[PDB]
Amino acid sequence: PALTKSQTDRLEVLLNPKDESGKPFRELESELLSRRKKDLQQIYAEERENYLGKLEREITRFFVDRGFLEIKSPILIPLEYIERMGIDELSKQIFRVDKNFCLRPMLAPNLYNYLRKLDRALPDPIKIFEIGPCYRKESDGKEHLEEFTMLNFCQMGSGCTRENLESIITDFLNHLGIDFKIVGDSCMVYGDTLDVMHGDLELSSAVVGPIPLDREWGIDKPWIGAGFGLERLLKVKHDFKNIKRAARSESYYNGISTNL
Amino acid sequence: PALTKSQTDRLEVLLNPKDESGKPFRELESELLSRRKKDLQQIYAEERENYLGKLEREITRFFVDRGFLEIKSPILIPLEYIERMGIDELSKQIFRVDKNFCLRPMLAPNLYNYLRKLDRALPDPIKIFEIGPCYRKESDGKEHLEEFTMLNFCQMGSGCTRENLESIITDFLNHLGIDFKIVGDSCMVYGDTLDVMHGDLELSSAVVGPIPLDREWGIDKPWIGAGFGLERLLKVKHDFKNIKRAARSESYYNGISTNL
Ligand SMILES: C[C@@H]1CCN[C@@H]1C(=O)NCCCC[C@@H](N)C(=O)OP(=O)(O)OC[C@@H]1O[C@@H](n2cnc3c(N)ncnc32)[C@H](O)[C@H]1O
Numbered sequence: 001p002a003l004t005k006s007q008t009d010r011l012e013v014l015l016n017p018k019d020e021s022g023k024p025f026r027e028l029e030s031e032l033l034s035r036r037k038k039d040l041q042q043i044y045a046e047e048r049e050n051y052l053g054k055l056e057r058e059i060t061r062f063f064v065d066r067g068f069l070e071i072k073s074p075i076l077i078p079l080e081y082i083e084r085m086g087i088d089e090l091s092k093q094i095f096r097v098d099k100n101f102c103l104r105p106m107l108a109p110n111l112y113n114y115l116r117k118l119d120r121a122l123p124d125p126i127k128i129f130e131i132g133p134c135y136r137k138e139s140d141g142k143e144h145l146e147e148f149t150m151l152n153f154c155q156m157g158s159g160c161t162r163e164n165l166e167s168i169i170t171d172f173l174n175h176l177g178i179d180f181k182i183v184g185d186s187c188m189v190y191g192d193t194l195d196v197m198h199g200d201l202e203l204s205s206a207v208v209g210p211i212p213l214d215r216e217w218g219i220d221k222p223w224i225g226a227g228f229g230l231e232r233l234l235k236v237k238h239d240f241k242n243i244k245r246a247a248r249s250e251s252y253y254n255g256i257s258t259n260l
Numbered sequence: 261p262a263l264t265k266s267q268t269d270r271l272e273v274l275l276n277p278k279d280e281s282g283k284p285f286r287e288l289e290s291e292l293l294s295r296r297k298k299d300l301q302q303i304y305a306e307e308r309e310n311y312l313g314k315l316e317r318e319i320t321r322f323f324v325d326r327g328f329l330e331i332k333s334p335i336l337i338p339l340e341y342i343e344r345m346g347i348d349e350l351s352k353q354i355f356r357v358d359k360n361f362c363l364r365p366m367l368a369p370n371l372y373n374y375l376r377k378l379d380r381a382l383p384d385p386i387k388i389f390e391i392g393p394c395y396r397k398e399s400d401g402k403e404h405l406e407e408f409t410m411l412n413f414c415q416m417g418s419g420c421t422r423e424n425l426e427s428i429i430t431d432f433l434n435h436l437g438i439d440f441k442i443v444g445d446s447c448m449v450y451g452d453t454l455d456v457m458h459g460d461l462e463l464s465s466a467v468v469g470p471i472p473l474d475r476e477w478g479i480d481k482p483w484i485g486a487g488f489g490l491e492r493l494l495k496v497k498h499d500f501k502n503i504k505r506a507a508r509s510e511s512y513y514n515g516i517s518t519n520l
Pocket residue numbers: 105106107108109111112136138143144145146148149150152153154190202203204205206207224225226227228229230231232
C-alpha cells in the first residue's frame with residue numbers, strides 16, 4: 001500500500017527539483033528513471049558541460065574581467081602553512097599527507113604568499129583570485145563536503161574598504177543570480193568576519209584587513225577578501241536538497257543520479 | 261670575473277625561453293628582474309589568465325565541441341580502486357590518505373565507473389573526458405611532477421578503432437600547435453600502448469580496448485582512450501627547460517619566476 005521509507009529514499013535519489021499516489025513504487029521509479037535518462041541524453045546531445053567546471057569558468061571570467069589575476073597554486077601544501085595560519089577544531093579537519101604535507105583546507109596561505117611576491121612586480125592595488133579543490137574532514141553531509149571547491153578573491157593596497165568588498169560580493173552574486181544577505185560574524189583564524197548568507201546557509205566568509213596574522217606572511221598593507229564554496233553556490237542555484245548533488249562525484253552528474 | 265655556478269642558476273631562474281659577458285652578475289640580474297617584472301605587469305594589465313587554467317579551458321572546449329561529455333569526479337579516491345586497476349612500482353607512488361583513501365594517480369578508475377553507469381542512459385557511443393589533478397610520488401623533477409594535471413578522454417561502443425584514436429590525438433595536438441609522433445609501446449596496467457612522443461618526452465599514453473581489466477569494472481564493450489599531462493603540453497608549447505615552470509606553483513606564474 002503506502003511507500004516504505006527505503007522506497008521513498010530511492011525515489012528522492014531520482015527526483016529533480018523541477019519534477020512535479022496511489023501509484024505503486026515500480027511505476028513511479030520507472031517514470032523517474034525515464035526522466036533522468038532523458039535529462040542526461042539532453043545534456044549529452046546539447047551542451048555537454050559539467051556544472052562544477054562550467055561554474056568555475058563563469059566565475060573565472062567574472063574576476064578576470066574585473067581586473068583580478070587568475071592563480072593556480074598547489075593543492076598539496078606544507079603542514080607548516082596550517083600552523084602559520086594560526087590553526088592549532090579546524091585542525092582535526094586537516095587531511096595529512098606524508099610527514100610534512102597536507103591537503104589544503106583553504107586558499108589563504110598560498111594567496112598570502114602570492115600577495116607578498118607580486119607586490120614586488122605589480123602596481124597597486126594587487127587583485128588576485130583562485131578557484132580550486134579544498135579538503136576538510138567533516139562530521140556532516142547536508143551542507144558539508146570533505147572534498148569541495150573554493151573561490152577566494154582578494155585585493156591588497158588601495159581601495160581595500162568594506163564598501164568595495166561588499167560591492168564586489170553584491171555584483172558577483174547578482175551576476176550569478178543567487179539571493180543573499182551579508183551579516184557581521186566572527187571566526188578563530190580571521191576576525192571579525194562578514195558572512196554572506198543564503199537563508200541559513202553560509203555562502204561565504206569575508207574579511208576586511210589588515211589583521212595581525214598578516215605579519216607572519218610578510219604582509220603590511222590593507223587588504224580585503226572572500227572565500228565562496230562553489231558547491232554551495234550550485235546547491236542554491238539549482239535548488240538541490242543535498243549538497244552531494246553539486247560535488248565531484250560518481251553518484252551524481254549535474255545533480256542527476258548516475259545510478260539508473 | 262666569470263659567473264659562478266650559483267649565479268648562473270640564479271640567472272637561469274630569471275631567464276625566459278625568448279630572451280636573447282663580460283657584463284657582471286649584478287647588472288645581468290638587474291636586467292632580467294626588470295624584464296620579468298614587465299612580463300607580469302603585461303599579463304596583469306591585459307589578459308590575466310593562468311596558463312594551466314587557460315589550457316584546461318581550451319582543451320575542455322575542444323572535447324565538448326567534438327561530442328565528449330565533461331566529467332568532474334573525485335580527486336580523493338578509495339584505495340580499492342588502485343588494486344582494482346591491477347596496480348600491486350606505480351604502487352610506491354600512491355599518496356595514501358586516511359586508512360581507506362588515496363590521491364588519484366590517474367583518471368582511469370573513475371572514468372571506468374562513468375562509462376559503465378552512463379551506458380544505461382546514453383546512446384552509443386559514449387564519449388567522455390576529464391581534466392584534473394593527479395598525484396604520484398616521483399624521484400625525478402625534469403619531466404616529472406608529484407602534483408600534475410591529466411587530461412583523459414575516451415570512447416566506448418562503436419568507432420573504437422586505432423584509426424579514430426590516432427585521428428583524435430592528431431586533431432588535438434595540431435589544434436594546440438604541438439609537434440608529436442605516435443610510437444607503439446607497453447605498460448603494466450594496460451598493454452600494448454601507443455605513446456605520443458615529443459622528441460624523448462612522453463605527452464601521452466593511449467590504449468585501444470578491450471583489455472581483460474575491463475571485466476573488473478563491468479565493461480564488456482570496445483573502447484579507446486588517452487591520457488595527456490597538461491604541464492608536459494605547456495612545457496613543449498612554451499619551450500620551458502624545466503616542467504616546474506608549468507606546474508601549480510608559488511615559484512612560477514605562467515613560467516615567470518615569482519621570486520623577484
Ligand atoms: C587570501 C587573503 C589572504 C588570506 N586570506 C585572505 C582572503 O582573501 N580572505 C579571508 C577570507 C577567505 C575565507 C577562507 N580563509 C575560509 O576558509 O573561510 P571558510 O568560511 O572556512 O571557507 C569559505 C567557505 O567555503 C565553503 N566551504 C567551507 N567548507 C566547506 C565544506 N566542508 N563543504 C563545502 N563548502 C565548504 C563555504 O561556502 C564558504 O563559507
